[PDB]
Amino acid sequence: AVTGSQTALLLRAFEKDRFPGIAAREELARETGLPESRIQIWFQNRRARH
């Protein structure tokens, strides 16, 4: 699971760039302190639900 702060940051990103490319995902990884693969999973999962 990701933290509340990470969720808030990722959701705001998702609502501006719904399909981040690898550079954007690596940047979100650095912003959040999450691995890039975890960023990708989070976006894939959210899009599969929406």
Author numbering: 5 to 54
Copy text from the publication.
DUX4, a member of homeobox protein family, is exclusively found in placental mammals. Compared to other homeobox proteins, DUX4 contains two adjacent HD1 and HD2 domain, connected by a short linker of 15 residues. Very recently, using next-generation sequencing technologies, a novel B-ALL oncogenic driver DUX4/IGH, derived from the insertion of chromosome fragments containing DUX4 gene into the IGH locus, has been reported in ~7% of B-ALL patients. In order to investigate how DUX4/DUX4 fusions recognize DNA, we have determined the crystal structures of Apo-DUX4HD2 and DNADRE-bound complex at the resolutions of 1.5 and 2.6 Å, respectively.
The N-terminal α1, α2 helices are anti-parallel. Compatible with its DNA binding activity, the electrostatic surface of Apo-DUX4HD2 reveals a highly positively charged pocket delineated by residues Arg137, Trp141, Arg145, Arg148, and His149 in the α3 helix.
